[PDB]
Structure formats: C-alpha cells, structure tokens
Amino acid sequence: VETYKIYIFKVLKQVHPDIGISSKAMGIMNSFINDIFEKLAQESSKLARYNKKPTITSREIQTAVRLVLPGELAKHAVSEGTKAVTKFTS
C-alpha cells in the first residue's frame, strides 16, 4: 500500500473546487488507486516476461490497460495516457 491521498485531493480540487471529501471516502479512493496500480504493474510485468522484453515501456502500460479495464473505460484511459506521454516528450 502507498498513499495517493494528497494527489487524489489535487484532482478533486480541479474537477470540484467547492466540494470536500470525508476521511472514509478518501480512504476508499486511495484503496481504489492502489488496487489499479497493482493490477496494471503486475499485468505489464506479465506482458514483458511473455515476450522476453527487458523494459516496461508506455506500450506495455497501454496493453496492460486493455487487458485490465473494460473496453470503453480502457479506450478513454489509453487516450489520456497517450495525451500525457505526447505532452511529456513535446
């Protein structure tokens, strides 16, 4: 387990500046993020081992998202991941 709470709150203050969050609700959000981090990191590990790849690249994270998220949610996550990497390299 890691804490993403202060970063979850940063996202809350972007999308709903005027809405707060209770301690238990933040706990649920943090448990959600941890759970997904593990699933995507573990799947990326699998995928890199399957094809004898030394390196987990943004491509392995993108394939991991498609193996883990439901199709429609995946397509949005892949678009947000790709948007970030395109900005980062710009």
Partner 1 sequence: TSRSSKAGLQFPVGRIARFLKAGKYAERVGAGAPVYLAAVLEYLAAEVLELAGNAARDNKKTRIVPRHIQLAVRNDEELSKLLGDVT
- Show the tokens assigned to 35: 């759970």
At residue 83's C-alpha, the angle toward residues 81 and 89, to 5°, is 100
Per-residue contact string for residues 15-44; x = within reach of partner 1 by CB under 8 A:
xx-xxxxx-xx--xx--xx--xx--xxx-x
Is residue 64 within 8 Å of residue 52, measured between CB atoms? no
Helix H or strand E encompassing 71: helix 71-89
How many chain residues interact with partner 1 (CB under 8 A)?
Answer: 55
Instruction: Summarize as ranges the residues that interact with partner 1 (CB under 8 A).
Output: 2, 4, 7-8, 10-12, 14-16, 18-22, 24-25, 28-29, 32-33, 36-37, 40-42, 44-45, 48-49, 53-58, 60-62, 65, 69-70, 72-73, 76-77, 80-85, 87-89
